[PDB]
Amino acid sequence: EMQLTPFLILLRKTLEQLQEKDTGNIFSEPVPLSEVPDYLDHIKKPMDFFTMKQNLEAYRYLNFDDFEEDFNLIVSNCLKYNAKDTIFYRAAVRLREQGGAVLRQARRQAEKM
Ligand SMILES: CN1C(=O)CNc2ccccc21
């Protein structure tokens, strides 16, 4: 029960804050299927920040949970695909930690709307 425009502004700002935590930009764009040809074997829904931005502007995120769900997918896909001893796996762990703090603060702002 709130106005749509300020909520989308908040999601845009939050998405920028999450991208800032992915310093290697490893989650900025879809995992390249031509470079990882087996990626889709067990990853049923790829996700990345560029796709999240598209979904946001298409009015596909109308509550915080739907936004946070796709962020969690970025993290979970990376934990699932990559072995524990890789930079990619540890990057997803760090993103989960740093991104969760960004998300808690952003949701507190949404609840004030
Ligand atoms: C597996 N993977 C990822 O999980 C994240 N991004 C990426 C870029 C290039 C090759 C592989 C990946």
Curated annotation (Swiss-Prot):
Summarize the protein's role: Scaffold subunit of various histone acetyltransferase (HAT) complexes, such as the MOZ/MORF and HBO1 complexes, which have a histone H3 acetyltransferase activity. Plays a key role in HBO1 complex by directing KAT7/HBO1 specificity towards histone H3 'Lys-14' acetylation (H3K14ac). Some HAT complexes preferentially mediate histone H3 'Lys-23' (H3K23ac) acetylation. Positively regulates the transcription of RUNX1 and RUNX2.
Protein name per Swiss-Prot or TrEMBL:
Peregrin
Recount the PTM note.
Acetylated by KAT6A.
In the UniProt entry, the disease listed is: Intellectual developmental disorder with dysmorphic facies and ptosis: An autosomal dominant neurodevelopmental disorder characterized by delayed psychomotor development, intellectual disability, delayed language, and facial dysmorphisms, most notably ptosis. Additional features may include poor growth, hypotonia, and seizures.
User: Source species, please?
Assistant: Homo sapiens (Human)
Top-rank lineage group of the source organism: Eukaryota
Gene (name only): BRPF1
- All residue ranges annotated as the Bromo domain in the record: 2-106
Where is it expressed, tissue-wise? High levels in testis.
The record describes its quaternary structure and partners as:
Component of some HBO1 complex composed of KAT7/HBO1, MEAF6, ING5, and BRPF1. Component of the MOZ/MORF complex composed at least of ING5, KAT6A, KAT6B, MEAF6 and one of BRPF1, BRD1/BRPF2 and BRPF3. Interacts (via PHD-type zinc finger domains) with unmethylated histone H3 at 'Lys-4' (H3K4me0). Interacts with trimethylated 'Lys-36' of histone H3 (H3K36me3). Interacts with ING5; interaction directs BRPF1 to H4K4me3-enriched chromatin at the 5' of active genes. Interacts with KAT7.
Subcellular location(s): the record lists: Nucleus; Chromosome; Cytoplasm
